[PDB]
Design a protein around this motif. Structure first.
Motif, PDB file in Angstrom:
ATOM      1  N   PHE A  39       0.528  -1.439   0.074  1.00 54.97           N
ATOM      2  CA  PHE A  39       0.365  -0.173   0.069  1.00 54.97           C
ATOM      3  C   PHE A  39       0.873   1.679  -0.241  1.00 54.97           C
ATOM      4  O   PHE A  39       1.882   0.847   0.532  1.00 54.97           O
ATOM      5  CB  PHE A  39      -1.009   0.184   1.238  1.00 54.97           C
ATOM      6  N   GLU A  40       0.612   2.121  -1.006  1.00 54.18           N
ATOM      7  CA  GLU A  40       0.532   3.446  -0.799  1.00 54.18           C
ATOM      8  C   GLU A  40       0.268   4.614  -0.344  1.00 54.18           C
ATOM      9  O   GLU A  40      -0.873   4.482  -1.818  1.00 54.18           O
ATOM     10  CB  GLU A  40       1.735   3.821  -2.065  1.00 54.18           C
ATOM     11  N   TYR A  41       0.046   6.099  -0.019  1.00 52.56           N
ATOM     12  CA  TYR A  41      -0.797   6.883  -0.058  1.00 52.56           C
ATOM     13  C   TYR A  41      -0.310   8.094  -1.545  1.00 52.56           C
ATOM     14  O   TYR A  41      -1.026   8.558  -1.329  1.00 52.56           O
ATOM     15  CB  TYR A  41      -1.051   7.287   0.557  1.00 52.56           C
ATOM     16  N   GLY A  44      -3.018   7.760  -3.788  1.00 50.52           N
ATOM     17  CA  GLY A  44      -4.469   9.187  -3.670  1.00 50.52           C
ATOM     18  C   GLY A  44      -5.550   8.605  -3.551  1.00 50.52           C
ATOM     19  O   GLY A  44      -6.501   9.007  -3.456  1.00 50.52           O
ATOM     20  N   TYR A  45      -5.668   6.925  -3.955  1.00 49.67           N
ATOM     21  CA  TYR A  45      -6.429   6.353  -3.155  1.00 49.67           C
ATOM     22  C   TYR A  45      -6.684   5.732  -1.765  1.00 49.67           C
ATOM     23  O   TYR A  45      -6.047   5.155  -1.421  1.00 49.67           O
ATOM     24  CB  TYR A  45      -6.865   5.025  -3.789  1.00 49.67           C
ATOM     25  N   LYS A  46      -7.899   5.157  -2.047  1.00 55.31           N
ATOM     26  CA  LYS A  46      -8.235   4.649  -0.360  1.00 55.31           C
ATOM     27  C   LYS A  46      -7.639   2.718  -0.427  1.00 55.31           C
ATOM     28  O   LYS A  46      -7.876   2.245  -1.102  1.00 55.31           O
ATOM     29  CB  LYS A  46      -9.743   4.967  -0.419  1.00 55.31           C
ATOM     30  N   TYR A  50      -8.299  -0.327  -2.460  1.00 55.16           N
ATOM     31  CA  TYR A  50      -6.650  -1.633  -3.024  1.00 55.16           C
ATOM     32  C   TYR A  50      -6.927  -2.052  -1.880  1.00 55.16           C
ATOM     33  O   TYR A  50      -6.514  -3.781  -3.362  1.00 55.16           O
ATOM     34  CB  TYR A  50      -5.748  -0.934  -2.671  1.00 55.16           C
ATOM     35  N   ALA A  51      -7.023  -3.083  -1.286  1.00 54.93           N
ATOM     36  CA  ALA A  51      -6.848  -4.049  -0.595  1.00 54.93           C
ATOM     37  C   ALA A  51      -8.324  -5.162  -0.411  1.00 54.93           C
ATOM     38  O   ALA A  51      -8.635  -5.789  -0.315  1.00 54.93           O
ATOM     39  CB  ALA A  51      -7.319  -3.559   1.409  1.00 54.93           C
ATOM     40  N   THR A  52      -9.571  -4.340  -1.281  1.00 52.42           N
ATOM     41  CA  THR A  52     -10.532  -5.056  -1.042  1.00 52.42           C
ATOM     42  C   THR A  52     -10.252  -5.782  -2.536  1.00 52.42           C
ATOM     43  O   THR A  52     -10.875  -7.675  -2.299  1.00 52.42           O
ATOM     44  CB  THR A  52     -12.032  -3.528  -2.147  1.00 52.42           C
TER      45      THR A  52
END
Length: 58
Positions: A39-41, A44-46, A50-52
């Motif tokens: 994961f990275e921010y 810009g995504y939630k 991404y985890a879904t």
DNA sequence: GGGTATTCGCCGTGTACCTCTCCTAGCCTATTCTGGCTGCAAAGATTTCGCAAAAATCTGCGG
């Protein structure tokens, strides 16, 4: 640990279609850890979005 | 002290046929690149099978 609820909610949809729910949530937790490692921010995504896909793949 | 006073699990349950095939479910669900594995096609290497064939061998009988 804070995102286990997403795994549980996603897996309970797949429980009615056979297979133990506990195995499903364990695999979803594996996928969740994989997503956390990736994961990275800066994207810009939630994180949930991404985890879904990772949890669905697992 | 102390003696029940409940609740809390565990266990046991006839024999032997026969006919039946019936056993089996959601579908909500993303893309792909790289590399190997395995069945198959192809080639070198090699042994194993039969006739060939003549030469040696086995067997029946009458003059």
């Amino acid at each position: 640990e804070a995102n286990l609820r997403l795994v549980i909610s996603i897996a309970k949809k797949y429980t009615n279609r056979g297979l133990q729910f506990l195995d499903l949530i364990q695999e979803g937790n594996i996928g969740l850890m994989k997503a956390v490692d990736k994961f990275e921010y800066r994207r810009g995504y939630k994180f949930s979005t991404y985890a879904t896909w990772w949890i669905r793949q697992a």
